Write a protein that binds this ligand. Sequence first.
Ligand code: ZN
Ligand code: ZN
Ligand code: ZN
Lengths: 176, 80, 62, 184, 105
Amino acid sequence: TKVLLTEILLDPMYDYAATVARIDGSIPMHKPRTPKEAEYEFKTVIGRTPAELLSQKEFYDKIYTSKYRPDFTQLTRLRDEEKTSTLIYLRAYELFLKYLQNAPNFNSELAEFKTYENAYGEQKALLAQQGFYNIFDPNTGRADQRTRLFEYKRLPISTLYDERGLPHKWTIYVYK
Amino acid sequence: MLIPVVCFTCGFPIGTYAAIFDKARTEYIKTKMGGTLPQNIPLDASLQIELKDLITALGIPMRVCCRTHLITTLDYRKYY
Amino acid sequence: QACYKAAEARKKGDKDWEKHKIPFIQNTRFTPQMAKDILAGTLTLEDLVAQGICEFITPEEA
Amino acid sequence: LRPQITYGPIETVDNEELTEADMLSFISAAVNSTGLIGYNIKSFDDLMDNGIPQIVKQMFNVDITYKDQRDHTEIDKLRESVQIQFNFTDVNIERPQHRNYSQGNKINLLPNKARLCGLSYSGPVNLAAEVILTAHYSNGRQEVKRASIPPFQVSTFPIMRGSNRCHTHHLSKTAKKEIGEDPN
Amino acid sequence: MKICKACSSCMVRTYVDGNIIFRCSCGESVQGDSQNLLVSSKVYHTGEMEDKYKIFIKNAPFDPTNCQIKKDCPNCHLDYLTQICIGSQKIIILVCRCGYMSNRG
Ligand SMILES: [Zn+2]
Ligand SMILES: [Zn+2]
Ligand SMILES: [Zn+2]
């Protein structure tokens, strides 16, 4: 019993099922303080007593299943946004539980819910924008292109050599 | 993980107008977003999203530090 | 071809042989509308390659 | 074959209005198509589905001959060598599994449990084979015995997290978030 | 070298009484007449000879990575040429796609 409890209590699956059970009140919101509360939480979440888990053979067949069965067919895009978030969470739990149980007709529903969650993630990323600004060039109507970069230009040869072909030596300072 | 209760620099009570500043800002972005995917907002190269008047209407003064921390602080709820 | 035609006109004694030349133009096919379509999610790199706008270059091919 | 497609003349393309900030969309598109580490996942995926099966089924055919070091017998004294010949036919790799309690049925092993318990995020490898043993006699004839072996698990191969053989691949982002994984 | 007629092997060259005699491992012996009077040779500056760059100079007008120059080609009257700078003495060659090539080659 101790080894079984230590193994399952450290399974993230158990914690996720326990959270789902806590949401609708099947188990107390506080973690167990006494062994009786732990046994009750195990019975509610896993669905089988630890003594009877060792006697039979399945494990995933009777894990908690949320009480409220909302309609996930409104996840077809169709007080609406928080309800959509609740539907996303509940369908994620239901699909994860189906994945554990190797339920038939699973990959197509997984892809459909992945598309739904991608749309929900687009909305959430819309909620997560600090903003953006572009310093517009007043002469134009868009991002500034003016720069102080170097621009090549073929200067006249008179700047380097005088009328007698000798190079210039600018070495006399004229002060006014 | 949220907008700080007070400005990190001087300690003005930024937090008491934080939540509102969040939500309102969103609609303003929705007004200026424009035919563009949300995650591509910081790459639009044509946006002029200015939040000066919103923060002014919130009553927050024109302090550099306070508006900096109000605008730039990331929210953990929006990434997790 | 404009250079050939301009030279051929000059060899015939024509005076305004320079009028047969055309300016050189090199440009990319990436338009500002394509940039706005990339941001909207309706234009990806795969269909930019499929339209002959960009291609993948390898260091020995570079 | 010669190319046939033709594009619009380059003199009609209007790009005078472009800016450098507009060209950041090209980098955005390139990163979105590429991803950031997508090559790692693709490489592990075609190692799983295509690499290891090919390596096992092609490059590990065994053909050896060994001396018969037995004692004296009618057949014994008259034979000198035995040829061991075998190859592997069927190869596959499954998702990581863990045995709950003792003598269970190999429940799934999530990555966070492997991290916490110090376990190995490795998936079983199942192989099948056919074996041929040829014994050579002194006179000149030989005897051949052939046997086909049902598929069996030999060991477990490490599995990259997020690949096709990972459990965090048939799960949604919310489920990944809530099982102790990083959804981002 | 001298190739044996019989077995097509590389014959060994020795020198006897003012003559070059090739002897093979199969016993066949021949004497070279004129074309085998070359004991050894070496060529210096192999990294900048004209035979080095023949293919490259031929392909230069079509290679898009070569430097161009605004000069008229005297053959086809094209207004640009391809400029290449080869060798340690920095020999400059102007080439065109019509076959024109400065240095008259
Ligand atoms: Zn402040
Ligand atoms: Zn010979
Ligand atoms: Zn030419």
